[PDB]
Structure formats: structure tokens, C-alpha cells
Amino acid sequence: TYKYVNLREPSMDMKSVTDRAAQTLLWTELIRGLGMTLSYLFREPATINYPFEKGPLSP
């Protein structure tokens, strides 16, 4: 019972290698990372206003 990783080779088909080349020379997934961070920007924060709102506890 195991699942070992990093089993992909860089595919020598022209489609996959030109997609990785356009990824390298067009800065794509960096913009995808910026999109994820903006997706957490427009959320609502989980900050309790501490000296008034005191945090939850246990019995």
C-alpha cells in the first residue's frame, strides 16, 4: 500500500513542450498565484476585536 510521486516525464509531444515554454516565457502560474492571493483578499477576516469580543473557550 503505497503511492510514490514524481512520476511524469516532460512530454516530448510538441503541444506539452510548447505549453511549458509559453509558461516559462509568459509568466503564467505566477499570475495564477496572484489570483489565488486576491481570492483571499476579497474574503472577510476572522479577527475578533479582542478587548471587547473575547475569544471562545470550553467548559
Binding site: 503541444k15 505549453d19 509559453a22 509558461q23 509568459l26 503564467t28
Partner: protein
């Protein structure tokens, strides 16, 4: 009766897939639309520069006729 904490008849499953959409354009399409907007900007740039040179030649003619 007894009042432990059991699960009620079984609960739903929770996923364990690396759920990735990998969306966005391909290499060829993004490449071509970038170069197309580039060439659009080049054509408009060429037009504005040559009409601007026409007007700047008119400014030269103004200083020529003004001088003596």
C-alpha cells in the same frame, strides 16, 4: 439509556483528490493573441508617428519663414 457520542448511522465521505482545474489558455492561443495586440499597437503607432512628422515639418516651415 446511554448517552455517548456515536456517529448517527454513518456520515458522508470527504474527498482526497488533488483537485486542480489547470484552466487558462494554451501556448498557441495566448501567444497569438499577445502578438496580435502587439501588431495592432505597431500599426497605430506607425500611423500616429507619420502624421506627427507631418505636423513637425509644418513647425520647421514656420521657423524658416519667420527667420530673416
Amino acid at each position: 439509556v446511554k448517552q455517548d457520542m456515536p456517529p448517527v448511522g454513518g456520515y458522508g465521505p470527504i474527498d482526497y483528490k488533488r483537485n486542480l482545474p489547470r484552466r487558462g489558455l494554451s501556448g498557441y492561443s495566448m501567444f497569438a493573441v499577445g502578438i496580435g495586440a502587439l501588431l495592432f499597437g505597431y500599426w497605430s503607432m506607425m500611423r500616429w508617428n507619420r502624421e506627427r512628422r507631418r505636423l513637425q515639418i509644418e513647425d520647421f516651415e514656420a521657423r524658416i519663414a519667420l527667420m530673416p
